[PDB]
Design a protein around this ligand. Structure first.
Ligand SMILES: *[B]([O])([O])[C]([C][C]([C])[C])[N]C(=O)[C]([N]C(=O)C1=[C][C]=[C]C(C2=[C][C]=[C][C]=[C]2)=N1)[C]([C])[O]
Ligand SMILES: *[B]([O])([O])[C]([C][C]([C])[C])[N]C(=O)[C]([N]C(=O)C1=[C][C]=[C]C(C2=[C][C]=[C][C]=[C]2)=N1)[C]([C])[O]
Ligand SMILES: [Cl-]
Ligand SMILES: [Cl-]
Ligand SMILES: [Cl-]
Ligand SMILES: [Cl-]
Ligand SMILES: [Cl-]
Ligand SMILES: [Cl-]
Ligand SMILES: [Cl-]
Ligand SMILES: [Cl-]
Ligand SMILES: [Cl-]
Ligand SMILES: [Cl-]
Ligand SMILES: [Cl-]
Ligand SMILES: [Cl-]
Ligand SMILES: [Cl-]
Ligand SMILES: [Cl-]
Ligand SMILES: [Cl-]
Ligand SMILES: [K+]
Ligand SMILES: [K+]
Ligand SMILES: [K+]
Ligand SMILES: [Mg+2]
Ligand SMILES: [Mg+2]
Ligand SMILES: [Mg+2]
Lengths: 202, 239, 233, 200, 216, 196, 123, 213, 234
């Protein structure tokens, strides 16, 4: 897997590849790793499919109930806190590297990483999963403060494409999402629409 | 007889044991809260039952979270237990959700706990009413009051205890929406002095607390110098 | 009918007060503390010549340095006595020292108000114990006599009577007791007092007597040793 | 350790060395391995030092409680049984204890071997500990039910001595007790070095 | 934690006349990967007390949550009593010991610094409940690379000024950046005095690479 | 290591067991008894792990005696065998398994003599003769060779003696003495020990 | 589970449930014991006759163990519970002491069972 | 495999005199090949009459000493007198055995006055076995100190020597000598020697410098 | 009436009779007095003796080095509460290595003793305490009641005829803060002596004294040890 999210002024962009593996068999080549947790809050999932699905459904329940009770949209920070509590408490029984991102009216676009082990840290942008290793140098060189939504989308799509080419456990299509006050816009980059970088032939 | 258990309705559909608990709050001396432009102020008429007691003994004003004050009337041991419940709820909320509990949610949660003691022969209703006050830039000023049945509402001004009505009628004279906490403490002290029956109960301490822009959203005791001035204003206004 | 943990308007637990009235239905026991040891003496109260006297046991050894005389509802005393025995042995086990008379009495006295019907385990104590106890022994404070009743109150006494004739016996005790009194004097004094208070004619089978002395372990008087002391009395 | 005991016409002889070790380090030369359970009952210790001390102390507690509740001396059979029932529950948890319970009750002289494996057996003679094999050789060649008292003392002392000589884990002094019908007595304590002088 | 995940490296502390200074880089490493390069490994506990942690960062965030809540609980009472640095160090020793005794440690090594009643406090606690005080401390590779330098200075001059302690800490942080492959040249310095707890950062040390041309 | 044997004739069951209690390289007792009287006409012979063997056999024994006291008559050798089995099997997968091997010998008024074999797994088999322990390996074929169902008790004791002599000759362990008992219509009889 | 306090003190130190239990015993059939020199004997009344009754099934004398028996008077269902409890206990004693119980031992056990049912909730 | 133990070094020693007890220890606290601190004594005052030395795994030394402190107060509250030296020893035995299946990794030596005012030393293994001794060494350098004490205090292996009473002054000289000898050869023992002298008049403290390498 | 047998039954006046009845247990105990200066907190207690040959009931109990209590009411309840206090104190020294502040211990008592006032079949505690302590905020005297309410006091008296002792304490309380120790204990004794029948006097047999302060751990004075304090009521 490769997952990523990026903050912009007014919202966030999220992305993932779509490969599920068992050993080196691809058990799903068009996985949706970006899961809505509330109207404007998504999580990107990596690690165990069973664990991250069970945890996401659980936090979706908790957050929904909390939100009805308060009669307000939930904070992104709350959603991240609930993932953190469950990923930290059960760190010995789960394999879950999560990114929580979304929009709320109080703090705007936010990205949090909850990596394995269950720590939580807010970041400008975050990457995770097995393929993230191959894009540290690329994201560190290419990231600029103040990118627009569109720039965040391209930056995300490029990073993911690079990771997907190299990481055997990542691949398929690139699913993207942008979240802002106005709502959630999702799209899929497939085939020729995935950014392309030549193999370096002699 | 129909009034011995909170698990027995009377034939008219009342729960007398809750009503009796309410009578314990109505026997108590008066506490008031006022919400204003930039915060919430609490004042309590704190009867001193012996000169042997220290200043500050039997406080009726509590910090239940850093941003939330509580003012009580009724049986004081029940109120204190409720202050512990409220504290525990604010603490647990912060642990689970990662931010300071919103006032309304805290009020509703502790109200459901009060409510749970009005259903059963196994336990008795709490003999206390209490107000919760907070302020934040995001939520503004908020003042809630909960009674022994577990009802919880929000208020501009509120009073509990034995001169409740007299206090309300004075609170209604204020245009509190446009006043600051610094102005309102004086008026709180004034009102407690008005409703205090100096013939029947001889000595009292005024207890004051506030939470607002001026304390940066922290619930704090009103400083000693400001309380003394407010007392002096209240006393001379009585004239 | 009210609950077992109900207070009266005087601030007493009804069940404890009633338990205290049950002590008056017991046989008279006497304890006296002297600088040479303590004695405990008890009226047996034989109800038929067909009963075996030696099967009435109202003075028991707690440990080698501590005895106990009981009055009231005797069947209730068993769990108290067993608790005292277990406790002194625990203390020996843990600390390699004998437990003081005061400490034994305290430990037993902490069971007293542990009754009630909706705090506790599926069938815990329903009522207080209908018994009073005199613990007599020797520890590093010297000889010592302690009294305990169903309220869980306990106190050291130079001399004390309990059961049916305790008023009476207590008056004679105030009369005869003195700080410098010998143990032999104390023994005689308590047999004289039992003799007054007892409905039956005192003899060597319808009473029991025990001592504990700085020299010597808990000792129950034999028929023959009782007869000897009875001669003068 | 080497401990032994035997029944004979005049009661039960009980003897032990006094060494303790932590691996090969000699931790003490003055351990008391014969424990006074009551004035008519002794227990011997071999194996884990803390295990033996604790469980035999607990046995002494229980025997004492018993005596108070029942108004009579516990039998050797019943005491040994209490000990076996206590340790049975811990089998497999690594307790190490081998003990002889030695007394004189209504059945006469009594001797039981009890260990942390769960064995409990009555017998005429036993030896327990890393030196037991050496004590058995000497004890077995000299033992008789009709030994005179002083001959029985000599045998026990010599058997433990000889065990201390061969077994690196036994040593110090030989401590000897005699259980008689009216109680045990402590008969002697002889440093193995002073015994060496004597037996040559 | 059975297996630590994102971890922090050394924490340093030294007493000085009027306070205590502690230092810690801002890195969370995931094995060799320098993964989260802007995290604070130092906590202001209350006005008199600060804490820095090596080891598993999630476990540190849990301690921070727990300890932060305890300090809030205590402040609510408004009763004139506060946890001293020594009390917090005691609490922390019990908490780590207790977790060690359930075979489920909090995977951290910590340095507690404080100033109360005219005394500088500096105390260590590790994941096993080993705890003690000393005039200077250093966890992880700092025990090998920084502690020798702290102790050598302290033996010549046991009483340091604030500015001397700060310079000495900076020299130690440089050595760590040279010689610990899990360090990072972005650190915080926290100081506690009469006035309270101040956390400074992000800070960097100057470095010298002249030795790169001294091979032939 | 421990040897048990049983031989059932038309109207009796003969049983025997070694008298050694061993530990490491030494015999610690030479007059050990491995038989437990359950009732007037039932013996349980029990070997296996230390502690388990006595704890198990005495628990069975007390419960069989309890059954007598509650009901005024005794459990049949077959009932007691199945009671024994139920207990062992119910403990097998518990926190407290008992590592014991058994024979149960008895005489019922109506059924006649019975001999039951049980292993630590709690498999129960009724048999005309049987044995447990390493010694069984050297003696079962002696029994197969010479046993007949109508064997008289005098010849059974002879047959038993052949088994025990074969241990003296061929078995590496020193088992010099054996307890011998027989059960019939008149209960349990102690025979002389067979000794070498 | 049912935790009502059933045996409680009344004014003057009476335990009414226990007194009422004693009234039950007084309406039971007469039972007598004599301790001989080297024999002990028990005899008990009746209870009702009735030709159609199987005599075996209603005895009021019962073995507790080989060396101890008992008779009772009072509620026969209650007796059966006590008897069975005592029979269990005789087997524990033999188990852990390897002696038969003394008569005093098992008496003391029965007595303390009976006492506990005067001071335990729900019974 | 998280290990719940680590070895932290430390040597302890106690000597019983006619009317005194000495309990002594070094002040180094170590781990692996490092020194945690040079000023960590291993002796702890329990009463006016009883001092305990503890070495081994420091996390257990701290916990156990805190448990003992609590239990002394519980005793005093329930029995209205301070625990004796002998009762503290017996109680420690049971507290150690309570962790028989997860032991306290601590070697304990108690030194104090018995009920007759005489010196008393009790020495323990980590699971609570113990006895009274005339003197005892424990911890890291115990095998180095013990034989010398056997010889010089016990007079073992010596002919033609008057078995005189041990004076405080000679006991003191011995204690300083053996720790100095131990600092030469045990890497864990060093920095400083702390000596507690328990007598009827109270508990006093001496400290002697040891090698810092 | 129908309202006085259960702690869970409010009366129509807003009272709970069981709690008021429990308070009567304290009013019938023997009197005790507590007072403080700037530096010390003192307890003084009258001990009742059953007969002429009885010792005299303990009234003053050690809780921790910095805390002691005087009791009035059910002795068994007094011990249970005292044992709770002791444990709370040991816990805080175990956890934090410092004394439990006296006002926090008292809060724990209020919270613990409130619980059975609200559950069916439970009863209040039938004991009142005077609590003497010393911590960072100086000396303290607190009072606790069966209602679970508690009070911070300049001085206090509870038990039989305590009104007299309270009057005395109000009369002289302006002197207490500046008193040396001897003066302060004298004041405690004079207050206590007001509670006695005119005939009867303070003696070494009936007076018990407890003191804690800055340089002094909680200490109990009984029997011959009270004589210094009784001589020079001159
Ligand atoms: B990504 O982290 O590489 C991806 C993210 C996930 C979809 C949220 N993870 C995987 O593909 C992982 N695969 C599984 O968890 C998986 C799916 C289906 C079956 C199994 C399986 C597990 C145990 C035994 C048999 C089959 N696993 C993968 C990295 O492990
Ligand atoms: B004998 O069996 O050789 C003897 C018996 C007796 C009761 C002392 N047993 C021992 O010497 C045993 N030794 C110990 O148990 C022992 C002695 C000193 C320290 C320790 C220890 C225990 C736990 C952890 C560390 C050290 N054990 C036997 C030889 O082992
Ligand atoms: Cl991760
Ligand atoms: Cl990740
Ligand atoms: Cl794919
Ligand atoms: Cl109101
Ligand atoms: Cl009486
Ligand atoms: Cl010896
Ligand atoms: Cl018993
Ligand atoms: Cl046997
Ligand atoms: Cl970061
Ligand atoms: Cl912080
Ligand atoms: Cl029962
Ligand atoms: Cl009182
Ligand atoms: Cl009382
Ligand atoms: Cl009140
Ligand atoms: Cl009062
Ligand atoms: K999935
Ligand atoms: K790929
Ligand atoms: K060294
Ligand atoms: Mg899993
Ligand atoms: Mg097993
Ligand atoms: Mg070195």
């Amino acid at each position: 897997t490769t997952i990523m999210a990026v903050q912009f002024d007014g919202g966030v962009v999220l992305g993932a590849d779509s490969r599920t593996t068992t050993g080196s068999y691809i058990a799903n080549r068009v996985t949706d790793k970006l899961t809505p947790i509330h109207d404007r809050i998504f999580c990107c999932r990596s690690g165990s499919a069973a664990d991250t699905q069970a945890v996401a459904d659980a936090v979706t329940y908790q957050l929904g109930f909390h939100s009805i009770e308060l009669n307000e949209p939930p904070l992104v920070h709350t959603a991240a806190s609930l993932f953190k509590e469950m990923c930290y408490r059960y760190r010995e029984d789960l394999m879950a590297g999560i990114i929580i991102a979304g929009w709320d009216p109080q703090e705007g676009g936010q990205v949090y990483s909850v990596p394995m082990g269950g720590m939580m840290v807010r970041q400008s942008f975050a990457i995770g999963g097995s393929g993230s290793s191959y894009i540290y140098g690329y994201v560190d060189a290419t990231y600029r403060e103040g990118m627009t939504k569109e720039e965040c989308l391209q930056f995300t799509a490029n990073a993911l494409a690079l990771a997907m080419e190299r990481d055997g456990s990542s691949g398929g299509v690139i699913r993207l999402a942008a979240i802002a006050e106005s709502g959630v816009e999702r799209q899929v980059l497939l085939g020729d629409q995935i950014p392309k970088f030549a193999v370096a032939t002699l | 007889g129909y009034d011995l258990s909170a698990s027995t309705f009377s034939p008219d559909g009342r729960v007398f044991q809750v009503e009796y608990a309410m009578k314990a709050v109505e026997n108590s001396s008066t506490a008031i809260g006022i919400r204003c432009k930039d915060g919430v102020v609490f004042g309590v008429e704190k009867l001193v039952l012996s000169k042997l007691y220290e200043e500050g003994s039997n406080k009726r004003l509590f910090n239940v979270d850093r941003h939330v004050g509580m003012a009580v009337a009724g049986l004081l041991a029940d109120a204190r237990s409720l202050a512990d419940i409220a504290r525990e709820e604010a603490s647990n909320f912060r642990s689970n959700f990662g931010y300071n509990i919103p006032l309304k949610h805290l009020a509703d949660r502790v109200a459901m706990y009060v409510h749970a003691y009005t259903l059963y022969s196994a336990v008795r209703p709490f003999g206390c009413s209490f107000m919760l006050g907070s302020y934040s830039v995001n939520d503004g000023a908020q003042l809630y009051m909960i009674d022994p049945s577990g009802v919880s509402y929000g208020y501009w001004g509120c009073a509990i205890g034995k001169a409740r009505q007299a206090a309300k009628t004075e609170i209604e004279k204020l245009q509190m929406k446009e006043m600051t906490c610094r102005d309102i403490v004086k008026e709180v002290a004034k009102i407690i002095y008005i409703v205090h029956d100096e013939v029947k109960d001889k000595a009292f301490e005024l207890e004051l607390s506030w939470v607002g822009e001026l304390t940066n959203g922290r619930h704090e005791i009103v400083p000693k110098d400001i309380r003394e001035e407010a007392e002096k204003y209240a006393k001379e206004s009585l004239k | 009918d009210r609950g077992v943990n109900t207070f009266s308007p005087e601030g007493r637990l009804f069940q404890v007060e009633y338990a205290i009235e049950a002590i008056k239905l017991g046989s008279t026991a006497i304890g006296i503390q002297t600088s040479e040891g303590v004695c405990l003496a008890v009226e047996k109260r034989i109800t038929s010549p067909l009963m075996e006297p030696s099967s009435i046991e109202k003075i028991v050894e707690i440990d080698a340095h501590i005895g106990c005389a009981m009055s009231g509802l005797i069947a209730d005393a068993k769990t108290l006595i067993d608790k005292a025995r277990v406790e002194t042995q625990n203390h020996w086990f843990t600390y390699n020292e004998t437990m003081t008379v005061e400490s034994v009495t305290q430990a037993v006295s902490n069971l007293a108000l542990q009754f009630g019907e909706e705090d506790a385990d599926p069938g815990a104590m329903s009522r207080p114990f209908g018994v009073a106890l005199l613990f007599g022994g020797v520890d590093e404070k010297g000889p010592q006599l302690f009294h305990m009743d169903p309220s869980g109150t306990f106190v050291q006494c130079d001399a004390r009577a309990i059961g049916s004739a305790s008023e009476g016996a207590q008056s004679s005790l105030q009369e005869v007791y003195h700080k410098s009194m010998t143990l032999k004097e104390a023994i005689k004094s308590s047999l004289i007092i039992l003799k007054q208070v007892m409905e039956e004619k005192l003899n060597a089978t319808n009473i029991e007597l025990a001592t504990v002395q700085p020299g010597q372990n808990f000792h129950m008087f034999t028929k023959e040793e009782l007869e000897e002391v009875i001669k003068d009395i | 350790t080497t401990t032994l005991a035997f029944k004979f016409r005049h009661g039960v002889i009980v003897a032990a060395d006094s060494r303790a070790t932590a691996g090969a380090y000699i931790a003490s030369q003055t351990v008391k391995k014969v424990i006074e359970i009551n004035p008519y009952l002794l227990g011997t210790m071999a194996g884990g030092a803390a295990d033996c001390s604790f469980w035999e102390r607990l046995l002494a507690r229980q025997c004492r409680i018993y005596e108070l509740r029942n108004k009579e001396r516990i039998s050797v059979a019943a005491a040994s049984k209490l000990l076996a029932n206590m340790v049975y529950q811990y089998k497999g948890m690594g307790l190490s204890m081998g003990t002889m319970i030695c007394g004189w009750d209504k059945r006469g002289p009594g001797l039981y071997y009890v260990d942390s494996e769960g064995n409990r057996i009555s017998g005429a003679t036993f030896s327990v500990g890393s030196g037991s094999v050496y004590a058995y050789g000497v004890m077995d060649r000299g033992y008789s039910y009709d030994l005179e008292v002083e001959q029985a003392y000599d045998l026990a002392r010599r058997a433990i001595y000889q065990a201390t000589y061969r077994d690196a884990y036994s040593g110090g002094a030989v401590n000897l007790y005699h259980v008689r019908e009216d109680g045990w007595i402590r008969v002697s304590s002889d440093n193995v070095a002073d015994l060496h002088e004597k037996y040559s | 934690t059975q297996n630590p995940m994102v971890t922090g490296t050394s924490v340093l502390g030294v007493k000085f006349e009027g306070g205590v200074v502690i230092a810690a880089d801002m890195l969370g490493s995931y094995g060799s990967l320098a993964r989260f390069r802007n995290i604070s490994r130092i906590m202001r506990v209350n006005n008199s007390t600060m804490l820095g942690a090596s080891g598993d960062y999630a476990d540190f965030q849990y301690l921070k949550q727990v300890l932060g809540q305890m300090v809030i609980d205590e402040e609510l009472l408004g009763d004139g009593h506060s946890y001293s640095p020594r009390a917090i160090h005691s609490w922390l020793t019990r908490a780590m010991y207790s977790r060690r005794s359930k075979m489920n440690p909090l995977w951290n090594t910590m340095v507690i610094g404080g100033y109360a009643d005219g005394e500088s406090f500096l105390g260590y606690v590790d994941m096993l409940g080993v705890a003690y005080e000393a005039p200077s401390l250093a966890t992880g590779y700092g025990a090998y690379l920084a502690q020798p330098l702290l102790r050598e200075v302290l033996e010549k001059q046991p009483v340091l000024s604030q500015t001397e302690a700060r310079d000495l800490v900076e020299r130690c942080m440089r050595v760590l950046y040279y010689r610990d492959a899990r360090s990072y040249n972005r650190f915080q310095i926290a100081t506690v005095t009469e006035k309270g707890v101040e956390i400074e950062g992000p800070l960097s040390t100057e470095t010298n690479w002249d030795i790169a041309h001294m091979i032939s | 290591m421990e040897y048990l044997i049983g031989i059932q004739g038309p109207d009796y069951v003969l049983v025997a067991s070694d008298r050694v209690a061993a530990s490491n390289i030494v015999q610690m007792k030479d007059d050990h008894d491995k038989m437990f009287k359950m009732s007037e006409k039932i013996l349980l012979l029990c070997v296996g792990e230390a502690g388990d063997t006595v704890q198990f056999a005495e628990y069975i024994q007390k419960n069989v005696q309890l059954y007598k006291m509650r009901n005024g008559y005794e459990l049949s050798p077959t009932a007691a065998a199945n009671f024994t089995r139920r207990n062992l099997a119910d403990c097998l997968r518990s926190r407290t398994p008992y590592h014991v091997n058994l024979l149960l010998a008895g005489y019922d008024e109506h059924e006649g003599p019975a001999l039951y074999y049980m292993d630590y797994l709690a498999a129960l088999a009724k048999a005309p003769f049987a044995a447990h322990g390493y010694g069984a390996f050297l003696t079962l074929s002696i029994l197969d060779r010479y046993y007949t169902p109508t064997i008289s008790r005098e010849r059974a004791v002879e047959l038993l003696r052949k088994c025990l002599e074969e241990l003296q000759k061929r078995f590496i362990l020193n088992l010099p003495t054996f307890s011998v008992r027989i059960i019939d219509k008149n209960g349990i009889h102690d025979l002389d020990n067979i000794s070498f | 589970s049912y935790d009502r306090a059933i045996t409680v003190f009344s004014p003057d130190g009476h335990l009414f449930q226990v007194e009422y239990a004693q009234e039950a015993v007084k309406k039971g059939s007469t039972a007598v014991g004599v301790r001989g020199r080297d024999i002990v004997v028990l005899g008990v009344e009746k209870k009702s006759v009735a030709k159609l009754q199987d005599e075996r099934t209603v005895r009021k004398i019962c073995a507790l163990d080989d060396n101890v028996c008992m008779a009772f008077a009072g509620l026969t269902a209650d007796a059966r519970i006590v008897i069975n409890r005592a029979r269990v206990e005789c087997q524990s004693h033999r188990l852990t002491v390897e002696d038969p119980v003394t008569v005093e031992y098992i008496t003391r056990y029965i007595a303390s069972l009976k006492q506990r049912y005067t001071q335990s909730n729900g019974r | 495999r998280f290990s719940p133990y680590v070895f932290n070094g430390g040597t302890i020693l106690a000597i019983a005199g006619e009317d005194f007890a000495i309990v002594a220890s070094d002040t180094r606290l170590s781990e692996g090949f490092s020194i945690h601190t040079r000023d960590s004594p291993k002796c702890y005052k329990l009463t006016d009459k009883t001092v305990i030395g503890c070495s081994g795994f420091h996390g257990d030394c701290l916990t156990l000493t805190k448990i003992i402190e609590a239990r002394l107060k519980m005793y005093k509250h329930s029995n209205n007198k301070a625990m004796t030296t002998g009762a503290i020893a017996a109680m420690l035995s049971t507290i150690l055995y309570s962790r028989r299946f997860f032991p306290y990794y601590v070697y304990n030596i108690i030194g104090g006055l018995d009920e007759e005012g005489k010196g008393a030393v009790y020495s323990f293994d980590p699971v609570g076995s113990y006895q009274r001794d005339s003197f005892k060494a424990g911890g890291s350098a115990s095998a180095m100190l013990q034989p010398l004490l056997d010889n010089q205090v016990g007079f073992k292996n010596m002919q033609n020597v008057e078995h005189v009473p041990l004076s405080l002054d000679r006991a003191m000289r011995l204690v300083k000598d053996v720790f100095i000898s131990a600092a030469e050869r045990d890497v864990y023992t060093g920095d400083a020697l702390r000596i507690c002298i328990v007598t009827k008049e109270g508990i006093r403290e001496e400290t002697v410098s040891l090698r810092k390498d | 009436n129908q309202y006085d047998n259960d702690v869970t039954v409010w009366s129509p006046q807003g009272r709970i009779h069981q709690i008021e009845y429990a308070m009567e247990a304290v009013k019938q105990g023997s009197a005790t007095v507590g007072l403080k200066s700037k530096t010390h907190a003192v307890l003084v207690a009258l001990k009742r003796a059953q007969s002429e040959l009885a010792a005299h009931q303990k009234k003053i109990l050690h809780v921790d080095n910095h805390i002691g209590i005087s009791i009035a009411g059910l002795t068994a309840d007094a011990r249970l509460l005292c044992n709770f206090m002791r444990q709370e104190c040991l816990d805080s020294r175990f956890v934090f290595d410092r004394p439990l502040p006296v006002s926090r211990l008292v809060s724990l008592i209020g919270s613990k003793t409130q619980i059975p006032t609200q559950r069916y079949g439970r009863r209040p505690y039938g004991v009142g305490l005077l609590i003497a302590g010393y911590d960072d905020m100086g000396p303290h005297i607190f009072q606790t009641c069966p209602s679970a309410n508690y009070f911070d006091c300049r001085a206090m008296s509870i038990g039989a005829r305590s009104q007299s002792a309270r009057t005395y304490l109000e009369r002289h309380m302006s002197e207490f803060m500046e008193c040396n120790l001897n003066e302060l204990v004298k004041h405690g004794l004079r207050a206590l002596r007001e509670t006695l029948p005119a005939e009867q006097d303070l003696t070494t047999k009936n007076v018990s004294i407890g003191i804690v302060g800055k340089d002094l751990e909680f200490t109990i004075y009984d029997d011959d040890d009270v004589s210094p304090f009784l001589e020079g009521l001159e």
